[PDB]
RNA sequence: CGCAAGACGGACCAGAGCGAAAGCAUUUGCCAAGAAUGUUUUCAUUAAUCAAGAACGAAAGUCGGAGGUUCGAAGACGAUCAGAUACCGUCGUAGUUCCGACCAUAAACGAUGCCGACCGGCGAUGCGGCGGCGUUAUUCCCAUGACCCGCCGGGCAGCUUCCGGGAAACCAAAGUCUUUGGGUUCCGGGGGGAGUAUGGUUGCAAAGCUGAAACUUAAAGGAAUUGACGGAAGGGCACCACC
């Protein structure tokens, strides 16, 4: 895992991709085009039980998983592309994503640039549910 | 009982009265 | 077929080169010219029955 | 059973030399085992660049699609693949209580490089406006839509791909659009928001390595 | 107000009300004596023309027909009539 | 992190869930240009000194 | 009887309009009957803009703001108490409360 | 990263427009149409409303052909529960999409026929017109646009009020009504039975249109008010509440 960078304080990228969604948060580093990825460790993986996979604790010990590996592996930076679930369904992130953001924040791991990559729709083919709604 | 349902057991009600006027033409 | 793009609509075609018009050769029916291959030559083409 | 990051090599991103900031980041690829070669699935990364760490101290909210065309050894020459605006700056633009025009041209330059370039206008409120609609007539919005259209046809056929990206760089076509249009509707908020590379011509290597120096 | 002027309106209120709401109904168009700087006569011409009026002897254009009252070529003088 | 110290100013109000924690303007002992508000336990009152583990946290004002 | 002098709604010389699926359901909800909030917001709240900017690479850089329009329905709106029950009088007040 | 498909046309998007209503939103081209305004044009009562007769008419549904990405009646399963053959989850048939014929119904609602007159104000907006300092772009001036102050006509609305009306809610129309008459079409006569039976007629069918009676019953019902209650939103208070 040896890169050929100078090693005084210069800054390695790497853009990760955040689909934090509603019932689990996704922590993706991958290199600044996304083609090769280097590690992916999510909120369903460090916690085994399903109520708690979209938990803010659940997704910090995610990104804390990711920033270890992504240290070892030559990264400094990051690029930060966060995700909704997107598409026809909501286009507003969920309940691990500012707790994803900042767990590798406080590693040490440089926050480089931010945006949202939710897969809006220009025009949405039907939406899952009904007429009537969602009744509960 | 719903007016609209009320309405439903009518029109099968009357879907077996030429159902059962058929049995003797 | 090598010729031609794909989603093109063609009839009696042949099924190896030469045999001279095998497939797809009964009255309204296409085959459609799936995907090319430049490397080996060869294409995907979606058959009357719908097997490519 | 054994660690994929024992393979992999970090190589230089160089930008064209039309851009001023050189480094853009290194890429881990897979060395040579099998048929398949480093270079080969290296070819075809789109590297979608802000400006500002791309050219010097300037907008932050330009993108630009970067394909690493041919890889030489420890370097990726890349090549402007599209320009991209960040949503964050193009869903910022499109608020309430204004008209918000569009027009799309597909326009091939000198060299076979047709792009589809895609420019946004939306109407302003005057200082001494009272009135909170400011919207346009249609017959106003398809005389801007109109005029749009044939900037980008005179500006994109005229000269070379080479010559267009150090338009794109500053607003050259999203300044042209934004004073010839005063004189129907009063716009503001005028860029070229978003340009897709669509068809290149047959890859020659040296017209590549003349973008990189 | 109860006691208005409707027998004998001000010239200002006969503004302020439509040419067939007027007391007595009365255009708001009317005919001016228009010249060009070309020629050396006056031809009468509409305020609505709604139609181009080509210059005697054929000249040119004068009056370019609009939604309402008819533009004049610029320099064209126009006196409005006393009837 | 070290153990910094904090002293009272003003109690802003009881917040929590029962009516318990006093939520404090405090001044840093250090610099009396940065405070902050805090989340405190037991009876508070002005001028006195909290044990603060860190000068990072700040509570939600209401 | 007639509750609201509008239609609880905002079409007056259409006869039809689009529907819009709720966001919280997915309820068929015509577009100017539906409660409509366009959300503006920083992607964190409070209390990570102080650490998120500590490790950032570059001299003071403004984060992204989140842009996203939420279309609520009648039953949505009074559960997750967007809208509420006004009285009879100050329903009549269409003045967006500050 | 490319690709192929069939849908859909966000944000802009509004108590904004158009259309007879249903309905109608990507770019451009094309083809007819239409109101409003403008008009010192033209015909000179040609008009209003209309039994009978007809055109169009969301969705679903029917027939055939093509297409089937999403969604998804029926249906398969997993949950929930005492049970759920329901809500909730994953699939999925008809359908949803288009072409040509059918069907003619919706809380097809403004639950308010259409044509006309008259009777308050107020600030907006949409379309055309008219006129008025100045600001602004085409700069190299005019005329146009953008605004800015008004006016007229027409339209969708809004606010206001002892216009008056009404059982009231509300309504510048739902007003001009015992001081009862502008014109005209459809239409209702306590609740049910019942939009049923029957006969015709329409349709491939589902079903539409027309449509009673025997009997049954002393109320059903409207608007408002006070209370009680709420698995509505708040605002309190109490060691028979918590902390």
């Avoid at chain 4, 041919?70 to 599209?82: M, P, R, S």
Wanted: charged share 30%.
């Amino acid at each position: 895992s040896l890169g050929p960078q100078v090693a005084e304080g210069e800054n390695v990228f790497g853009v990760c991709h955040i689909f934090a969604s509603f019932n689990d948060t996704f922590v993706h580093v991958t290199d600044l085009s996304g083609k090769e990825t280097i590690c992916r460790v999510t909120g369903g993986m460090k916690v085994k039980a399903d109520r708690d996979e979209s938990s803010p604790y659940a997704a910090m010990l995610a990104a804390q998983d990711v920033a270890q590996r992504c240290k070892e592996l030559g990264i400094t930076a990051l690029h930060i592309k966060l995700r909704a679930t997107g598409g026809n369904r909501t286009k507003t992130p969920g309940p691990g994503a500012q707790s994803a953001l900042r767990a590798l924040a406080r590693s040490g791991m440089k926050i480089g640039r931010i945006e949202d990559v939710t897969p809006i729709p220009s025009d949405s083919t039907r939406r899952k549910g009904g007429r009537r709604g969602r009744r509960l | 009982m719903r007016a609209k349902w009320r309405k439903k057991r009518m029109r099968r009600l009357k879907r077996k009265r030429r159902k059962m006027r058929q049995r003797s033409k | 077929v090598g010729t031609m793009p794909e989603g093109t609509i063609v009839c009696c075609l042949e099924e190896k080169p030469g045999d001279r018009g095998k497939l797809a050769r009964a009255s309204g029916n296409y085959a459609t010219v799936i995907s090319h291959n430049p490397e080996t030559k060869k294409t995907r083409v979606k058959l009357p029955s719908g097997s490519k | 059973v054994v660690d994929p990051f024992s393979k992999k090599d970090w190589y230089d991103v160089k930008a064209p030399a039309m851009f001023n900031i050189r480094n853009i980041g290194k890429t881990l690829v897979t060395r040579t085992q099998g048929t398949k070669i480093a270079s080969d699935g290296l070819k075809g990364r789109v590297f979608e660049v802000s400006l500002a760490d791309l050219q010097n101290d300037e907008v932050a909210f330009r993108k630009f699609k970067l394909i690493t065309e041919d890889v030489q050894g420890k370097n990726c020459l890349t090549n402007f693949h599209g320009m991209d605006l960040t949503r964050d700056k193009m869903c910022s633009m499109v608020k309430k209580w204004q008209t918000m025009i569009e027009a799309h041209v597909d326009v091939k330059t000198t060299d076979g490089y047709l792009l589809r370039l895609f420019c946004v206008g939306f109407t302003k409120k005057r200082n001494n406006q009272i009135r909170k609609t400011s919207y346009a007539q249609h017959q106003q919005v398809r005389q801007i839509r109109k005029k749009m259209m044939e900037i980008m046809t005179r500006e994109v056929q005229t000269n070379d791909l080479k010559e267009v990206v150090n338009k794109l760089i500053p607003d050259s076509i999203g300044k042209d659009i934004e004073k010839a249009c005063q004189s129907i509707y009063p716009l503001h908020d005028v860029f070229v928001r978003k340009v897709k590379m669509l068809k290149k011509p047959k890859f020659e290597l040296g017209k590549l390595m003349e973008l990189h120096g | 107000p109860l006691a208005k002027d409707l027998l004998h309106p001000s010239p200002e209120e006969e503004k302020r009300k439509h040419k067939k709401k007027r007391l007595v109904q009365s255009p708001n168009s009317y005919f001016m004596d228009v010249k060009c700087p070309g020629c050396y006569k006056i031809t009468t011409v509409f305020s609505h023309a709604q139609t181009v009026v080509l210059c005697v002897g054929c000249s040119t254009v004068l009056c370019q027909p609009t939604g309402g009252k008819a533009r004049l070529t610029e320099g064209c003088s126009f006196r409005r009539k006393q009837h | 992190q070290p153990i910094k110290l904090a002293r009272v100013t003003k109690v802003l109000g009881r917040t929590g869930s029962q009516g318990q924690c006093t939520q404090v303007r405090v001044e840093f002992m250090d610099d009396t240009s940065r405070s902050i508000i805090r989340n405190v336990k037991g009876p508070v009152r002005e001028g006195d000194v909290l044990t603060l583990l860190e000068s990072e946290r700040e509570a939600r004002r209401l | 009887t007639k509750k609201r002098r509008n239609n609880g709604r905002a079409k007056k010389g259409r006869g039809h309009v689009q529907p819009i699926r709720c966001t919280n359901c997915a309820c068929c909800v015509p577009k100017d009957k539906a409660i409509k909030k366009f959300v503006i917001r920083n992607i964190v709240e409070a209390a990570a803009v102080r650490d998120i900017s500590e490790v950032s690479v570059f001299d003071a850089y403004v984060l992204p703001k989140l842009y996203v329009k939420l279309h609520y329905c009648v039953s949505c709106a009074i559960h997750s108490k967007v809208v509420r029950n006004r009285s009879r009088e100050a329903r009549k007040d269409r003045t967006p409360p500050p």
